[PDB]
Structure formats: C-alpha cells, structure tokens
Amino acid sequence: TSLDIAEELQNDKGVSFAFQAREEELGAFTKRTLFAYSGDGLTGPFKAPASAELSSFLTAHPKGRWLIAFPLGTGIVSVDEGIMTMEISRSLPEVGSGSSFYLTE
Amino acid sequence: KTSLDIAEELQNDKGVSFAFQAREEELGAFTKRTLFAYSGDGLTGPFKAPASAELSSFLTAHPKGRWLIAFPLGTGIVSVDEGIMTMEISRSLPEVGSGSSFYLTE
Amino acid sequence: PSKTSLDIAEELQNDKGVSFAFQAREEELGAFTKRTLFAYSGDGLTGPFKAPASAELSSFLTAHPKGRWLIAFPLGTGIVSVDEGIMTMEISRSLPEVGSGSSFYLTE
C-alpha cells in the first residue's frame, strides 16, 4: 500500500548511502519519508547522481530540501539536475541511519 | 494490525502549524503507539493548540503521560490537557523539522 | 499485501530492573531490504544495559553489516550488540530517561 523508491548512491570517493523514499496516504493527508543509511563517515557534503525517480521525490518537499537527524549530526539533502547534495552540520565519523518526513493535506 | 492511523493539522494562536500523525499497531502480545510530528515553522517557546478528541485520547494513553520527542535541532515534550496540546521545547528552534516518539507495551 | 516479512517484539530487563521493549522489523522493498530495530524505555540508564535476549532477537541483532546498532535517543546515543544471546547496549552519557529511537540499515 505504501509506495517506495530504494537505491544506493556513491560519491567519487566511494562513500555509499542507501535511501528509501516512501509515500503513504492517510485519508486527506499524504506523508513522504526519506530514510537514509550509511556505514561510512563524511568530512564534507555527500554528492552523487540520483535516479530521476528519487530526484523527483526529493524535489517535492515544501522546503525544497530534507533536514535529517543522524546519531552524530544533522544533514540537509537536496537535488539539482539529478545530483544529490547532502550538506552536514559537522564531519561525521559514521553516518548511521535517520529519517526525515513531511505530511501535507 | 495497524489499528489506528490518524493525521491532523494543529495551529497555535500565532500561526505556527504542525502536522501530527498518531499510529497504533498490534504486534502479537505488544501494542506500539507512535506520534509523528512535522513543522516547517520555527518555535520560540511552547506550542499550544487545540487537538481533536481522538488525538487527545491517543496522547493521554502514554505510560509517562507525555511524549518525549527528538527533532533535528532540539527536543520536545508533547502533552494534552482537556483537548489542548502543549509541546514544550528544550531551546528555541529556528526550524522544527520532523520527528517521532513511540512506546511499546504488553 | 504487506511488505513486512518480520515483526517481533520483546521486553528485556537487566539485573537492576531497568526494562526495555525492542521491536525488530524486516521490510522487503524490492531490490532492497530494510531491517529496523526500535527501542523504548521509560527508565534511565546510568551505564550499559545488559540483558538476555531471545534466540530470534539475537539472530536479528547479529545480522547487521556493522555487527551492532548505532541508535539515537532524545538525550544521547547507544550502541546495541549481542553476544551469546546477551544484549549489551553501551551509551554515550548517563541518560536520566531513555525514551524511544530506532536504528536501521538497507541492503541489496
């Protein structure tokens, strides 16, 4: 019943992230959740080509980007011409997992 | 198995608005209740807003009587009293973002 | 049809009577599978939480590509591992209250 996009992205240094983008209907409301996982660390922003389908999901957020909490820091995921950038609040020795959603009527 | 899944938009007297979802799930001997919260706004202080009777009933059921909830930039505690939600916050938030709080019980 | 292929839940308790509820969930999302550990306690924790876990939960806990589960709670961070059916959750700081959080990974 939920609709999911799932894919693994990699940057030019071989850091890998997996993302799941979920859409759910809750009567008059729709909820869209981005789930993100990496075992790697990041010094700086993660930049990688994303599918057209993930890019379209990412663009739909009312803020135009996805503020996301991980265990050791905060990210903001955006997309421009099919390239994801996730900026980070601090260097992350390990990213771990987190999720960011919105609901709209 | 998902026994309840309601969603509601709440707004305080100064136009800050939140979407809340309340989900109840049955997991064999366990029940799980999850509160999801989203706002694109900031909060300077506690968020106080009228809630539906159904959401209010859900919010009251928690064994702690309130819902400790992590957001990206700070922490909230959501409670309800006669249909009025209060969410107190750990620090002023220039943007709230999303988070969730759940418990499991037998 | 559900995408949930495993959904189990159990209460664990240490020798001091701190109690946690854990839920282990597997979701099949096509080429990818997600495995999530959910953890809840109304208690505080002064130090690592150690408690026996079921065979099924222990198998789930072991499967992670890191061999353990980094998990964010509202007031601090934990790492959940299992060894011979004993869970240990180490914590980043003493927690006057644990609350809830979840840790997942996605695998192809």
Residue numbers in the entry:
A (entry chain B): 240 to 344
B (entry chain C): 239 to 344
C (entry chain A): 237 to 344
Give verbatim excerpts from the published study on this entry.
Trimeric fibre proteins protrude from each of the twelve vertices. Despite the low sequence identity with other fibre heads, the topology of the beta-sandwich is identical to that of known adenovirus fibre head structures and contains ABCJ and GHID beta-sheets (the E- and F-strands in the long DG-loop of human adenoviruses 5 and 2 are absent). However, it is significantly more compact, making the 107-amino acid long SnAdV-1 fibre head the smallest adenoviral fibre head structure known.
In this work, we present the structure of the SnAdV-1 fibre head domain solved by X-ray crystallography, using the multi-wavelength anomalous dispersion (MAD) method. The structure of the SnAdV-1 fibre head domain was determined by multi-wavelength anomalous diffraction up to 1.6 Å resolution, using data collected from a selenomethionine derivative crystal as described. Four monomers were present in the asymmetric unit, three (chains A, B and C) forming the biological trimer and the other (chain D) forming a trimer with two crystallographically equivalent monomers in the crystal (space group I213 has a three-fold crystallographic symmetry axis). Amino acids from the N-terminal T7 and 6xHis tags could not be modelled in the structure due to lack of density, as was also the case for residues 234–236 of each of the chains and residue Lys345 of chains A, B and C. Using NCS-restraints, the structures of both the seleno-methionine variant and native protein could be refined to low R-values at 1.6 and 1.7 Å resolution, respectively, with good geometry and Ramachandran statistics.
